[PDB]
């Protein structure tokens, strides 16, 4: 068995600009240490099928790109949720087949209302479903 | 199978949860190990390891959902609304040992009135 799984929350509240990687600095779980909390990037060392998910607290317009790739990162999907002024939680999820060295991370856009507070968490999680060979 | 663990439970009651109270999901969809107890509202770990917990809670006023682990608040997600129905969702991966307890709770924002056809669900499963 390969146990690869991470859950990480964001506790810094510096404003995100466009195309910045969204860092989840605080590690709840990081089994096999394939999530990098200094960056916010998961890096695949064991190729196979993975599920990635997040829940982001927000007070305004939030759009985030889910990014994937080895060399140049590419957008898989964009998730958008438009709060007007008020506290909300939004979610996105995806099953990805990953090769070795593929990075997976969330990327900021111009709609950057994402907060990390004790009473309104933002969390990024992922786990291996089935390894390869 | 006794060496696995999976549940999905729902909440069917007109009684709203009290502020700061544990949310009891009183109706089973799947629970073959009995790991969630629908009369106490608590998961209790039988098989140790890494679990994924996730919920989706319907509400028409302000709701914060808290995940607790043996009396310590793990995560909190909040959703504000005044009349319209929305879904509050949250989730977390936790490594658990035998006898550890997991439940969901509300804080001072406690509403769980969905419109008809909008439900509230809590799920968990052992991953490895």
């Amino acid at each position: 068995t390969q146990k690869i799984a991470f859950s990480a929350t964001r506790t810094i509240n510096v404003p995100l600009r466009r195309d910045q990687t969204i860092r989840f600095d605080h590690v709840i779980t990081n089994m096999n240490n394939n999530y990098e909390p200094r960056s916010g990037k998961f890096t695949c060392k064991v190729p196979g099928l993975y599920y990635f998910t997040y829940h982001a607290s927000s007070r305004g317009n939030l759009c985030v790109n889910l990014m994937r790739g080895r060399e140049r990162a590419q957008k898989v999907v964009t998730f958008c949720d438009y709060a007007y002024n008020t506290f909300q939680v939004t979610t996105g999820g995806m099953v990805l087949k990953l090769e070795q060295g593929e990075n997976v991370f969330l990327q900021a856009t111009d709609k950057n209302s994402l907060l990390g507070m004790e009473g309104a968490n933002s969390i990024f999680s992922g786990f291996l479903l089935f390894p390869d060979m | 199978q006794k060496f696995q663990s999976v549940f999905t439970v729902t909440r069917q009651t007109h009684q709203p949860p009290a502020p700061n109270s544990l949310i009891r999901f009183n109706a089973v969809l799947t629970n073959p190990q009995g790991d969630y107890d629908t009369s106490t509202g608590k998961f209790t770990c039988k098989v140790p390891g890494l679990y994924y917990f996730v919920y989706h809670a319907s509400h028409t006023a302000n709701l914060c959902v808290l995940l607790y682990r043996s009396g310590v608040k793990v995560v909190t997600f909040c959703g504000h609304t005044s009349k319209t129905n929305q879904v509050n969702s949250g989730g977390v991966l936790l490594r658990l040992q035998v006898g550890e307890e997991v439940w969901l709770a509300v804080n001072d924002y406690y509403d769980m009135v969905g419109i008809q056809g909008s439900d509230s669900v809590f799920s968990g499963f052992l991953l490895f």
Partner: nanobody
Framework: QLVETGGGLVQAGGSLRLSCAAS????????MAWFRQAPGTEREFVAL???????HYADSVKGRFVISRDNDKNMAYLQMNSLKSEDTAIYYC???????????????????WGQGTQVTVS
């Protein structure tokens, strides 16, 4: 094991850098915290840093202390400025391998400690 170093005698208004060296396992997935104990009162929280570098400070040290860490070298640091006689204490470094989604300021959350280092201010 954690080992605190860097303490000693400082004149008030001065600066001091403490170091906490970790060993046994990698601590890159742990919360690191500094606690302090002056004689006569209890172990008060000073500062903490998450795995990825997120810093959180007590109100008494905000604007004066900087907590940092180096995941490649298994090190955590407390850079202290504008030192006052109230900062005289034994300083303790602690690690939490199993935090909740927000890092704790309670000393009972920190599963390993070191032999503290003594800071004496003027």
């Amino acid at each position: 094991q954690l080992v605190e170093t860097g303490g000693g005698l400082v004149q008030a208004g001065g600066s001091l850098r403490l170091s906490c060296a970790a060993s046994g396992r990698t601590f890159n997935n742990d919360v690191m915290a500094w606690f302090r104990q002056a004689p006569g009162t209890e172990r008060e929280f000073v500062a903490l840093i998450t795995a990825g570098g997120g810093t959180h400070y007590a109100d008494s040290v905000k604007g004066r202390f900087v907590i940092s860490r180096d995941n490649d070298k298994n090190m955590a640091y407390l850079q202290m400025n504008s030192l006052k006689s109230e900062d005289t204490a034994i300083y303790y470094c602690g690690a939490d391998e199993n935090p909740p989604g927000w890092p704790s300021r309670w000393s009972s959350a920190y599963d390993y400690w070191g032999q503290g280092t003594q800071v004496t201010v003027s």
